[PDB]
């Protein structure tokens, strides 16, 4: 008959964190295939004892005392689980050696032998041994020895952002110099040193487009996109009117009807090199301003970061261009026969103008003017043309006129 007790397989050590749920499994088999009892108990007590302390160590075994419940293929599974109290000690003696016994249906029970038979040690550790926080992105501040509440909130946010797997019940404290204390729910802590959380902001924002000339064609609306970034990733102000000369130029452009829009100025993380802050300048230089050496506005812009560092005044320009600088007429698809190449008739001029018109729809402005000259060359006058800033193209008479005079006999 069966004289062999069941075989019990279980972890020798189970680390359980203070405050948290723990669970592990004990596996029991027997050659009979049936196990009738699995017991977790204190060493103390008579052979029949099932007294077990602490009260929060719990166990359960589904399928007890069922034929076929304890085979090698399908071992009997006993769950050992509980919640460690939040105020349990985590000292070296905060451990429990408890004994697991099993009995088959023939009554064979595993022997209970102090420090030798089947047992586990449940070891209670602080939550900080489970969690290792990651360093945040550096927060750049005006004074790393005296953080503002805004600085501290930013460090906490950057620590929480880099630590999505820490307990949600974890609290964060930032000291005057940026040292971060993370307090887990059991009162254990981690520290992130100030060197890994904050540094002094010593670099003013950068105007990426310093020195750039933005071309605006007279009489056509244009835009200029200006880009800024800071080492902190944040700009708080862009200032085109930092002194009298700058202000004058700025207000002159406003006077022409331009707009300046920097929509992300109040957003966080609005100004990195990869994703810079963008100021868009939109407007039209009217034709009443001529192009030429003086046909320009030289601006000065400054940008300030959240620590109060303001860049030097940095130059960019708007430079005016005539429309002829961006348009090139297409020649007519055929020449027009002329009886007298030195003096076209009205009908010949009309025919040329029509061919030049047809060749240029979709290319030149719809409000260009064509003047067919007496020799059949065509003056193209763009709508920004003025006496002070002529804006024109010429199509030569070899591209428009074909002499029809016969050849001698
Ligand atoms: C009460 C007594 O003297 N009993 C002895 C008995 O001693 C127990 O033997 C166990 C091993 O079989 C352990 O060595 C027990 O020590 C520990 C443990 O379980 O590891 C030490 C831990 O530090 C302690 N944990 C805490 C938080 O204090 C636990 C705990 O007090 C108990 O597990 C109760 O939950 O105990 C040791 O106490 C053994 O020596 C037998 C031999 O026959 O004689 C008496 O029964
Ligand atoms: C208008 C004025 O006299 N402002 C002076 C200021 O002198 C200005 O300083 C600017 C640099 O910050 C430019 O050098 C200004 O010159 C230009 C320019 O912007 O490039 C010359 C251009 O030809 C002119 N454009 C047109 C279409 O006439 C512009 C334009 O007049 C201005 O930008 C409008 O404000 O100006 C230069 O004039 C400087 O001298 C300060 C010192 O306190 O005093 C006034 O603000
Ligand atoms: Ca057996
Ligand atoms: Ca830790
Ligand atoms: Ca900065
Ligand atoms: Ca042209």
Residue numbers in the entry: 252 to 660
The publication says:
First, it contains two copies of the Siglec and Unique domains in tandem (SK1Siglec1-SK1Unique1-SK1Siglec2-SK1Unique2) with sequence identity/similarity of 39%/56% between the two Siglec domains and 44%/50% between the two Unique domains. The second way that SK1BR differs from other structurally characterized Siglec-like binding regions is that each of the putative Siglec domains of SK1BR contains a noncanonical YTRY sialic acid–binding sequence motif that lacks the central Thr-Arg deemed to be critical for binding in other Siglec-like adhesins.
We therefore determined cocrystal structures of SK1BR soaked with either 10 mm sialyl T-antigen (sTa), a core 1 glycan that can be conjugated to Ser or Thr residues of glycoproteins, or 10 mm 3´-sialyl-N-acetyllactosamine (3´sLn), a trisaccharide that can be a component of larger, branched glycans. For both sTa and 3´sLn, we observed the appearance of unambiguous electron density adjacent to the noncanonical YTRY motif of both SK1Siglec1 and SK1Siglec2. SK1Siglec1 hydrogen-bonds to the sialic acid and galactose of both sTa and 3´sLn via the YTKY sequence. Consistent with the crystallographic temperature factor analysis, SK1Siglec1+Unique1 showed a statistically significant preference for sTa.
